[PDB]
């Protein structure tokens, strides 16, 4: 429960989860993309190239 000061005009509380969302770039032969994207503390990084 994030209790705060009341606002005059409607705002947007920027929720910031400082979690990990890093890439990993390969190139096995001349024209390939084996680049690995990961959403680790999300655990929803279900698919990557």
């Amino acid at each position: 429960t994030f209790e705060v000061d009341p606002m005059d005009e409607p705002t947007l509380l920027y929720v910031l989860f400082e979690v990990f969302d890093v890439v990993r770039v390969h190139r096995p032969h001349r024209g390939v993309i084996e680049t690995v994207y990961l959403r680790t503390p999300f655990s929803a990084g279900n698919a990557t190239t």
């Binding site: 959403r39 999300f42 655990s43 929803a44 279900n46 698919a47």
Partner: protein, 100 residues
């Protein structure tokens, strides 16, 4: 669950359970006063006998639906593989930006 008197927003917030096997989903829309309430067997407030959408199968409201938006893991939508052209939102109705 119902949608408010003139508002047009609603989520789903149900806790964790085993999701072992599935076949699909089927959303449907229908008036509250057009539908009786279960449990006791008899209804007092339900002063509208006819044109029941859910308990009979006759359904005119599905077309009004704007956008299906799915999220399980609070991060990625249904195709976590970015399959469909629009990854997060799935448009049923259009405000028209590109009619193609």
């Amino acid at each position: 669950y119902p949608i408010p008197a003139n508002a047009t927003n609603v989520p789903i917030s149900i806790p964790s359970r085993n999701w072992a096997a599935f076949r699909g989903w089927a959303f449907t829309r229908l008036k509250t006063k057009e539908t009786p309430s279960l449990g006791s067997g008899y209804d007092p407030y339900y002063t509208y006998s006819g044109s029941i959408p859910y308990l009979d199968g006759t359904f005119y409201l599905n077309h009004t639906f704007k956008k299906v938006a799915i999220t399980f893991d609070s991060s990625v939508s249904w195709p976590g593989n970015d399959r469909l052209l629009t990854p997060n939102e799935f448009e049923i109705k259009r405000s028209v930006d590109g009619e193609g």
